[PDB]
């Protein structure tokens, strides 16, 4: 019906905390996902740029 494309840039170690069911700092203070599924998660290394 719709597509939500959310975008940001975070650490390479903290990239694991973008998930429903994970704890830490990123998950607990900045961003989180509910007790449901998301479409997909994508993350590419772009420190070169």
């Amino acid at each position: 019906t719709n597509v939500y494309a959310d975008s940001f840039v975070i650490r390479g170690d903290e990239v694991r905390q973008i998930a429903p069911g994970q704890t830490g700092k990123i998950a607990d203070y900045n961003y989180k996902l509910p007790d449901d599924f998301t479409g997909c998660v994508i993350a590419w290394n772009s420190n070169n740029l």
């Binding site: 429903p20 069911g21 704890t23 007790d35």
Partner: protein, 49 residues
Amino acid sequence: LSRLDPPEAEVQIDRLITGRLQSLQTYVTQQLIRAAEIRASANLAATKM
């Protein structure tokens, strides 16, 4: 419920739930059988009266 997170508490609560449901169902079925027997005995007693 006290010392665990909903994403994990789901599975433990589900295990307890399915076990208690099986126990309640067993109880209900055995009560049905015993009540059928009691009905037959009360029919005998009504005819004897």
